[PDB]
RNA sequence: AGCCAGGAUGUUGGCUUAGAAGCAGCCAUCAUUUAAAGAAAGCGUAAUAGCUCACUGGUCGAGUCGGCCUGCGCGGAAGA
């Protein structure tokens, strides 16, 4: 491994995502193969392609040490294997989604998915979200209001 | 920045010499400028691992002898023929 | 099993040990590395 | 496809899907149909191009029949009808003899888009500069 | 140090070979995707296949690694 000089950047870099980020998720890749990552890195990709990360890191001692800034809700995530997955634009999206659409093929766990942050909270699957530009389901809204 | 610690010799001589390198000590000697040459005693394994450094032979270096710091320059060595350790060193006042 | 005056490991599976009064290597993959009298 | 099988891949040929001393045999003989490649290998096959090297996977069990696959050309390949020379050396690579064009390499590469890791297709071109200084043949760029 | 995981894509790099697909030889040893993963440290193969390592993620929870100099010892050591 390195020294200090690195394991201070794997900070100062992964703590401005979260400094500067939207969205966060949860899993626990016991089994992680890596067509695992090669498909989520495509997901990415939609998701714009390197916008997205995953950086194993659940070391308390490093994806925590970016926590007691934000996300102090994550004290409770980091033990054991974890995979934090930070957003930086898009909607607070459909990177919510995919992790239990994905996990829930096998691939592996998904920690139960033990969840994060956009509120200050914990789990459960929502698709409350790209909706997002789903203002037309406001636009039908209206002439449907109008007419009916 | 190399800070020797050392001590005048008391003894001179072949016999001296010898005994004191059996006390991990070794001889040297500090002469130049216009004043008169010095006998000194250093500690071996220190000026080893200081050696070590390239630097030790081209910097100027200090010695601590007697509490003066004399200031010098290493001119030259005297490694022991098969071993890993010194014989002699000439320092030149600088 | 060979058993030569000096022994040294071969493979990086070869393991060497002092039993009784002798030293010997044994190799967990390769019978051929069995040795004594070292 | 979430889970291998068995896949033997020896590149085939298009204009006529019917080998015998190259492959032939060899291509079907263990719960596989020869008489099937050429029903729908060739469904396959003029839709795009006809001759150049092909590898392949095919989807047997022990099923009788089966559906077949497609896949991609070799990349340091793209380097002989689509760069100069075929072989590679002549002297041996003690000696740096090969030669390159620039232009090629991206939009050459970019064809092997369906078969690459890097996300930034200029990424899938810094792939290719040691896949073609394989042999030390230096580029005009 | 154990134990769980992964240990990947260009791609069998190129050359050379009947076959050299990480691994007989020669030259190169980059670039991706990354948490990390050698154009490969060893097993293996006709060659592929197959099993490991380096490396990184997890677990664990405080010491731990290997060179230099030296003292005393061990094997090496069979005879009428
Ligand atoms: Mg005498
Ligand atoms: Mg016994
Ligand atoms: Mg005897
Ligand atoms: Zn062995």
Same mark, same amino acid.
């Given at each position: ?148 | ?41 250093? @500690? ?45 060193? @000439?320092?030149?006042?600088? | ?38 | ?141």
């Amino acid at each position: 491994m390195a020294l200090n000089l690195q394991d201070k950047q794997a900070i100062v870099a992964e703590v401005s995502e979260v400094a500067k980020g939207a969205l966060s998720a949860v899993v626990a890749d016991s089994r992680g193969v890596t067509v695992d990552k090669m498909t989520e890195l495509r997901k990415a990709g939609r998701e714009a392609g390197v916008y997205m990360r995953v950086v194993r890191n659940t070391l308390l001692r490093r994806a925590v040490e970016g926590t007691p800034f934000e996300c102090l809700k994550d004290a409770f995530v980091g033990p054991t294997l974890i995979a934090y997955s930070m957003e930086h634009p898009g909607a607070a999206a459909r990177l919510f989604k995919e992790f239990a659409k994905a996990n829930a093929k096998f691939e592996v766990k998904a920690a139960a998915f033990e969840g994060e942050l956009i509120p200050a909270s914990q789990i459960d699957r929502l698709a409350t979200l790209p909706t997002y530009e789903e203002a037309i389901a406001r636009l039908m809204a209206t002439m449907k209001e109008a007419s009916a | 920045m190399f800070t020797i610690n050392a001590e005048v010799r008391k003894e001179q001589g072949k016999g001296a010499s010898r005994r004191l390198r059996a006390a991990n000590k070794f001889p040297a000697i500090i002469y130049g400028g216009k004043e008169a040459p010095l006998a000194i005693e250093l @500690d071996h394994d220190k000026v080893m691992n200081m050696q070590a450094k390239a630097e030790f032979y081209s910097e100027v270096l200090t010695i601590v002898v007697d509490g003066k710091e004399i200031k010098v320059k290493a001119q030259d060595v005297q490694r022991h023929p098969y071993k890993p350790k010194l014989q002699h060193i @000439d320092f030149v006042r600088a | 099993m060979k058993v030569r005056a000096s022994v040294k490991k071969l493979c990086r599976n070869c393991k060497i040990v002092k039993r009784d009064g002798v030293i010997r290597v044994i190799c967990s993959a390769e019978p051929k590395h069995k040795q004594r009298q070292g | 496809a979430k889970k291998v099988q068995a896949y033997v891949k020896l590149q085939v040929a298009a204009g006529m899907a019917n080998p015998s001393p190259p492959v032939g045999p060899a291509l079907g003989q263990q719960g596989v149909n020869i008489m099937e490649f050429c029903k729908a290998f060739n469904a396959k096959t003029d839709s795009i191009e006809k001759g150049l090297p092909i590898p392949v996977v095919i989807t047997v069990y022990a099923d009788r029949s089966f559906t077949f696959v497609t896949k991609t050309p070799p990349a340091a390949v793209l380097l002989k009808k689509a760069a100069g020379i075929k072989s590679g050396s002549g002297k041996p690579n003690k000696d740096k003899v090969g030669k390159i064009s620039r232009a090629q390499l991206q939009e050459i590469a970019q064809t092997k888009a369906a078969d690459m890791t890097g996300a930034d297709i200029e990424a899938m071109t810094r792939s290719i500069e040691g896949t073609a200084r394989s042999m030390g043949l230096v580029v005009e760029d």
